[PDB]
Design an enzyme around this catalytic site. Structure first.
Site, PDB file in Angstrom:
ATOM      1  N   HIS A 180      -5.975  -4.840   0.719  1.00 31.41           N
ATOM      2  CA  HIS A 180      -5.262  -4.532  -0.558  1.00 31.41           C
ATOM      3  C   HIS A 180      -6.230  -4.164  -1.696  1.00 31.41           C
ATOM      4  O   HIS A 180      -5.968  -3.208  -2.478  1.00 31.41           O
ATOM      5  CB  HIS A 180      -4.432  -5.790  -1.024  1.00 31.41           C
ATOM      6  CG  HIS A 180      -3.321  -6.182  -0.091  1.00 31.41           C
ATOM      7  ND1 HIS A 180      -2.411  -5.287   0.399  1.00 31.41           N
ATOM      8  CD2 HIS A 180      -2.961  -7.398   0.400  1.00 31.41           C
ATOM      9  CE1 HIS A 180      -1.562  -5.912   1.206  1.00 31.41           C
ATOM     10  NE2 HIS A 180      -1.855  -7.206   1.206  1.00 31.41           N
TER      11      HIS A 180
ATOM     12  N   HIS B 191       1.005  -3.415   3.217  1.00 29.72           N
ATOM     13  CA  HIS B 191       1.328  -4.116   4.447  1.00 29.72           C
ATOM     14  C   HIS B 191       1.701  -3.200   5.580  1.00 29.72           C
ATOM     15  O   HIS B 191       2.396  -2.172   5.382  1.00 29.72           O
ATOM     16  CB  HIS B 191       2.440  -5.146   4.211  1.00 29.72           C
ATOM     17  CG  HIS B 191       1.932  -6.324   3.417  1.00 29.72           C
ATOM     18  ND1 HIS B 191       2.728  -7.125   2.635  1.00 29.72           N
ATOM     19  CD2 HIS B 191       0.693  -6.854   3.347  1.00 29.72           C
ATOM     20  CE1 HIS B 191       1.996  -8.047   2.034  1.00 29.72           C
ATOM     21  NE2 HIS B 191       0.752  -7.941   2.490  1.00 29.72           N
TER      22      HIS B 191
ATOM     23  N   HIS C 120      -7.831  -9.477   5.281  1.00 31.55           N
ATOM     24  CA  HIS C 120      -6.506  -8.920   4.913  1.00 31.55           C
ATOM     25  C   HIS C 120      -6.473  -8.555   3.453  1.00 31.55           C
ATOM     26  O   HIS C 120      -6.198  -7.402   3.095  1.00 31.55           O
ATOM     27  CB  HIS C 120      -5.348  -9.970   5.137  1.00 31.55           C
ATOM     28  CG  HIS C 120      -3.981  -9.455   4.751  1.00 31.55           C
ATOM     29  ND1 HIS C 120      -3.117  -8.890   5.662  1.00 31.55           N
ATOM     30  CD2 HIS C 120      -3.349  -9.366   3.548  1.00 31.55           C
ATOM     31  CE1 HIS C 120      -2.001  -8.506   5.056  1.00 31.55           C
ATOM     32  NE2 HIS C 120      -2.108  -8.785   3.778  1.00 31.55           N
ATOM     33  N   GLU C 121      -6.886  -9.499   2.626  1.00 32.31           N
ATOM     34  CA  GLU C 121      -6.674  -9.357   1.175  1.00 32.31           C
ATOM     35  C   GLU C 121      -7.619  -8.259   0.654  1.00 32.31           C
ATOM     36  O   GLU C 121      -7.273  -7.508  -0.226  1.00 32.31           O
ATOM     37  CB  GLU C 121      -6.939 -10.722   0.477  1.00 32.31           C
ATOM     38  CG  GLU C 121      -5.824 -11.873   0.755  1.00 32.31           C
ATOM     39  CD  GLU C 121      -4.386 -11.426   0.604  1.00 32.31           C
ATOM     40  OE1 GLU C 121      -3.528 -12.099   1.178  1.00 32.31           O
ATOM     41  OE2 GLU C 121      -4.051 -10.416  -0.131  1.00 32.31           O
TER      42      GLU C 121
HETATM   43 ZN   LIG Z   1      -0.956  -8.888   2.029  1.00 31.85          ZN
END
Ligand SMILES: [Zn+2]
Ligand SMILES: [Ca+2]
Ligand SMILES: [Ca+2]
Ligand SMILES: [Ca+2]
Ligand SMILES: [Zn+2]
Lengths: 159, 164
Positions: free
Chosen positions: A117, A123, A113-114
């Site tokens: 970014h 998101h 997930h990170e």
């Molecule tokens: Zn996030």
């Protein structure tokens, strides 16, 4: 920056959580990078010294940036979009208990997930996306696959 | 930014302010101007949040200024704070049950009970005063039946259970 203006990125695992043996942190992160590598032209090479693009660390509470972690639960991790210095980096809250499987907070799933970014993703509103901001994926670990929504978002940036 | 989701009861019980409100650069926090229409806890015109989503900044998706939102937030140094891990929802997206929760029923659980999210493999209960929240496990989302129709309330002492 909305995206890395280059295709060949570096990362470094700066420190290690006492929750996990070093090899376990390493495999989780490698795996998380692989998820993104395999749907983009990007590559990731591991540095062990100096300043890499994606600096990856574990911290508790106040830890050098302007966003103190908040102890067990609440936020598990955060990251910065593409750019220099802090931008690109990933911090995991070591007030969580990081696990190789899903007995605790799964490092691989949260890194993946990170890292989204770090590459420029925001998101997602789709509860089935990796980019969903809630720790949302733990049920699918054994055969993990990126959402088409995630595939769409990453390929819109990098082709 | 990755969060444990809060159940509405949790959000109510842990927040300093629970209100209904309308929403109207090189900088660490962003702020939205709001108009409070109701206070449910905390007896307010801006709400602050980290400036990017990546570091847990709430990003408001609504192009309707007359839309009411439930915000459950932390007060710090005079200011209301939210993050991606707060409970923030359009009022109208709530079920009638959830509305009663914020209005009246959630407060019954605060002292005695805790909602515990099942985010893990066994997923074990530490106390009889805990209720296990399995909406994500079951239906792949935190917006499931336990969220939308159940509170975690005292049954007898040492024992909280899910009640409607
Ligand atoms: Zn996030
Ligand atoms: Ca960096
Ligand atoms: Ca935390
Ligand atoms: Ca830890
Ligand atoms: Zn940080």
């Amino acid at each position: 920056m909305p995206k890395w203006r280059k295709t060949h990125l570096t990362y470094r695992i700066v420190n290690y959580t006492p929750d996990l043996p070093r090899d376990a942190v390493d495999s989780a992160i490698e795996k998380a990078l692989k998820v993104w590598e395999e749907v983009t032209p990007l590559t990731f090479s591991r540095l062990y010294e100096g300043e890499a693009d994606i600096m990856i660390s574990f911290a508790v509470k106040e830890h050098g940036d302007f966003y103190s972690f908040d102890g067990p639960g609440h936020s598990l991790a955060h990251a910065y979009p593409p750019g220099p210095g802090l931008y690109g980096d990933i911090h995991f809250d070591d007030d969580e208990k990081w696990t190789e499987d899903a007995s605790g907070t799964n490092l691989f799933l949260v890194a993946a997930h990170e890292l989204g970014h770090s590459l420029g993703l925001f998101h997602s509103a789709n509860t089935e996306a990796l980019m969903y901001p809630l720790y949302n994926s733990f049920t699918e670990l054994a055969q993990f696959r990126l959402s088409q929504d995630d595939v769409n978002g990453i390929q819109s940036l990098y082709g | 930014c990755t969060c444990v989701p809060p159940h509405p009861q949790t959000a109510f019980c842990n927040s300093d302010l629970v209100i209904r409100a309308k929403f109207v650069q090189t900088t660490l926090y962003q702020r939205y101007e709001i108009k409070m229409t109701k206070m449910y806890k905390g007896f307010i015109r801006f709400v602050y949040t980290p400036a990017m989503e990546s570091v847990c900044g709430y990003f408001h998706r609504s192009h309707n200024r007359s839309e009411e939102f439930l915000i459950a937030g932390k007060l710090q140094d005079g200011l209301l704070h939210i993050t991606t891990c707060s409970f923030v929802a359009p009022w109208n997206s709530l079920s009638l049950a959830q509305r009663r929760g914020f209005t009246k029923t959630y407060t019954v659980g605060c002292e005695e009970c805790t909602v515990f999210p099942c985010l893990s493999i066994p997923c074990k209960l530490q106390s009889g005063t805990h209720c296990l929240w399995t909406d994500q496990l079951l239906q792949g989302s935190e917006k499931g039946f336990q969220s939308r129709h159940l509170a975690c309330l005292p049954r007898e002492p040492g024992l909280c259970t899910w009640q409607s």
